[PDB]
From Swiss-Prot, chain A:
The lineage of its organism: Eukaryota, Metazoa, Chordata, Craniata, Vertebrata. The chain holds residues 453 to 504 of 643 of the full protein. The CUE domain is required for recognition of misfolded proteins such as mutant CFTR. The VCP/p97-interacting motif (VIM) is sufficient for binding VCP/p97 to form a complex capable of transferring VCP/p97 from the cytosol to microsomes. This is E3 ubiquitin-protein ligase AMFR. Interacts with RNF5. Also forms an ERAD complex containing VCP/p97, NGLY1; PSMC1; SAKS1 and RAD23B required for coupling retrotranslocation, ubiquitination and deglycosylation. Interacts with DERL1. Interacts (through a region distinct from the RING finger) with UBE2G2/UBC7. Component of the VCP/p97-AMFR/gp78 complex that enhances VCP/p97 binding to polyubiquitinated proteins for their degradation by the endoplasmic reticulum-associated degradation (ERAD) pathway. Interacts (via the VIM) with VCP/p97. (Microbial infection) Interacts with Staphylococcus aureus HIgB; this interaction regulates AMFR-mediated inflammation by promoting TAB3 ubiquitination to promote TAB3-TAK1 complex formation. Coiled coil: none annotated. It is linked to Spastic paraplegia 89, autosomal recessive: A form of spastic paraplegia, a neurodegenerative disorder characterized by a slow, gradual, progressive weakness and spasticity of the lower limbs. Rate of progression and the severity of symptoms are quite variable. Initial symptoms may include difficulty with balance, weakness and stiffness in the legs, muscle spasms, and dragging the toes when walking. In some forms of the disorder, bladder symptoms (such as incontinence) may appear, or weakness and stiffness may spread to other parts of the body.
Swiss-Prot record, chain B:
The modification Phosphoserine is found at S65. This is Ubiquitin. The chain holds residues 1 to 76 of 685 of the full protein. The modification (Microbial infection) ADP-ribosylthreonine is found at T66. Changing S65E: Phosphomimetic mutant that binds and activates PRKN. It comes from the Eukaryota. It is found in: Cytoplasm; Nucleus; Mitochondrion outer membrane. Changing R72G: No effect on ADP-ribosylation. The modification ADP-ribosylglycine is found at G76. Changing S65D: Phosphomimetic mutant that binds and activates PRKN. Changing R72A: Impairs ubiquitination by CRL2(KLHDC3) E3 ligase complex. Impairs ubiquitination by CRL2(KLHDC3) E3 ligase complex.
Protein backbone atom coordinates (compact mmCIF):
# COMPACT_ATOMS: atom_id res chain seq x y z
CA UNK A 1 0.00 0.00 0.00
CA UNK A 2 2.70 2.48 1.11
CA UNK A 3 -0.14 4.77 2.20
CA UNK A 4 1.40 5.73 5.53
CA UNK A 5 4.96 5.31 4.24
CA UNK A 6 4.50 7.72 1.32
CA UNK A 7 2.67 10.19 3.55
CA UNK A 8 5.49 10.09 6.09
CA UNK A 9 8.10 10.54 3.36
CA UNK A 10 6.15 13.55 2.10
CA UNK A 11 6.27 15.01 5.60
CA UNK A 12 10.08 14.90 5.48
CA UNK A 13 10.04 16.62 2.08
CA UNK A 14 8.17 19.41 3.84
CA UNK A 15 11.07 19.69 6.28
CA UNK A 16 14.05 19.24 3.99
CA UNK A 17 13.34 21.04 0.67
CA UNK A 18 16.77 20.04 -0.65
CA UNK A 19 16.70 16.24 -0.53
CA UNK A 20 15.44 14.15 -3.51
CA UNK A 21 12.11 12.45 -2.78
CA UNK A 22 13.43 9.14 -4.14
CA UNK A 23 16.28 9.28 -1.62
CA UNK A 24 13.85 9.87 1.24
CA UNK A 25 11.78 6.79 0.39
CA UNK A 26 15.04 4.83 0.39
CA UNK A 27 15.51 4.76 4.17
CA UNK A 28 11.76 4.99 4.71
CA UNK A 29 11.75 1.33 3.69
CA UNK A 30 14.65 0.51 6.01
CA UNK A 31 14.14 2.25 9.35
CA UNK A 32 10.54 3.17 8.50
CA UNK A 33 10.90 5.98 11.03
CA UNK A 34 10.90 9.58 9.78
CA UNK A 35 12.82 10.52 12.91
CA UNK A 36 15.71 8.07 12.46
CA UNK A 37 15.58 8.70 8.72
CA UNK A 38 15.99 12.48 8.75
CA UNK A 39 18.56 12.11 11.55
CA UNK A 40 20.62 9.63 9.53
CA UNK A 41 20.22 11.82 6.43
CA UNK A 42 21.66 14.73 8.39
CA UNK A 43 24.49 12.43 9.48
CA UNK A 44 25.46 11.76 5.88
CA UNK A 45 23.81 8.35 5.55
CA UNK A 46 22.15 9.55 2.37
CA UNK A 47 24.30 11.17 -0.30
CA UNK A 48 23.04 14.75 -0.31
CA UNK A 49 23.00 16.65 -3.66
CA UNK A 50 26.67 17.25 -4.37
CA UNK A 51 27.74 19.18 -7.51
CA UNK A 52 30.07 17.02 -9.55
CA UNK B 1 7.50 37.52 18.28
CA UNK B 2 5.69 34.32 17.26
CA UNK B 3 7.20 31.54 15.14
CA UNK B 4 6.05 28.20 13.73
CA UNK B 5 7.81 24.98 14.69
CA UNK B 6 7.41 22.12 12.23
CA UNK B 7 7.79 18.52 13.37
CA UNK B 8 8.26 15.22 11.54
CA UNK B 9 4.99 14.03 13.08
CA UNK B 10 3.01 16.80 11.40
CA UNK B 11 2.45 19.08 14.35
CA UNK B 12 2.83 22.85 14.00
CA UNK B 13 3.83 24.26 17.38
CA UNK B 14 3.47 27.99 17.94
CA UNK B 15 6.03 29.42 20.34
CA UNK B 16 7.03 32.93 21.32
CA UNK B 17 10.65 33.95 20.94
CA UNK B 18 12.69 37.05 20.15
CA UNK B 19 15.32 37.83 17.45
CA UNK B 20 17.95 38.04 20.20
CA UNK B 21 16.99 34.60 21.53
CA UNK B 22 19.53 31.80 21.38
CA UNK B 23 18.85 28.55 19.48
CA UNK B 24 19.68 26.63 22.65
CA UNK B 25 16.99 28.55 24.55
CA UNK B 26 14.47 27.87 21.79
CA UNK B 27 15.13 24.14 22.07
CA UNK B 28 14.70 24.41 25.84
CA UNK B 29 11.28 25.98 25.28
CA UNK B 30 10.39 23.06 23.00
CA UNK B 31 11.59 20.56 25.60
CA UNK B 32 9.05 22.08 27.98
CA UNK B 33 6.26 21.48 25.48
CA UNK B 34 7.16 18.18 23.82
CA UNK B 35 9.35 16.71 26.55
CA UNK B 36 12.14 15.79 24.15
CA UNK B 37 15.63 16.83 25.42
CA UNK B 38 17.44 19.56 23.39
CA UNK B 39 20.25 17.05 22.87
CA UNK B 40 18.02 15.06 20.51
CA UNK B 41 16.62 18.22 18.97
CA UNK B 42 18.03 19.06 15.55
CA UNK B 43 16.79 22.50 14.52
CA UNK B 44 16.82 23.14 10.78
CA UNK B 45 16.03 26.39 8.99
CA UNK B 46 15.58 26.56 5.21
CA UNK B 47 17.47 23.27 5.03
CA UNK B 48 20.42 24.43 7.12
CA UNK B 49 21.24 23.26 10.63
CA UNK B 50 21.05 25.69 13.53
CA UNK B 51 23.92 25.57 16.02
CA UNK B 52 23.17 25.79 19.76
CA UNK B 53 25.37 28.83 20.33
CA UNK B 54 23.65 30.99 17.72
CA UNK B 55 20.91 33.60 17.88
CA UNK B 56 17.79 33.95 15.74
CA UNK B 57 19.34 37.10 14.26
CA UNK B 58 22.35 35.05 13.10
CA UNK B 59 20.35 33.13 10.50
CA UNK B 60 18.08 36.17 10.08
CA UNK B 61 14.98 34.49 11.45
CA UNK B 62 12.13 36.99 11.33
CA UNK B 63 8.63 36.74 12.79
CA UNK B 64 6.16 34.14 11.49
CA UNK B 65 9.09 32.10 10.17
CA UNK B 66 8.96 28.31 10.00
CA UNK B 67 11.55 26.28 11.90
CA UNK B 68 12.01 22.58 11.20
CA UNK B 69 12.60 20.36 14.22
CA UNK B 70 14.28 17.08 13.31
CA UNK B 71 14.51 14.33 15.92
CA UNK B 72 17.70 12.33 16.43
CA UNK B 73 17.64 8.59 17.04
CA UNK B 74 20.69 6.35 16.93
CA UNK B 75 18.38 3.36 16.97
CA UNK B 76 16.84 1.52 14.07
Amino acid sequence: SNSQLNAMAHQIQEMFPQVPYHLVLQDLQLTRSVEITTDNILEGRIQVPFPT
Amino acid sequence: MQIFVKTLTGKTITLEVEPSDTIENVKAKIQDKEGIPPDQQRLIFAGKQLEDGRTLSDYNIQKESTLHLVLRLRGG
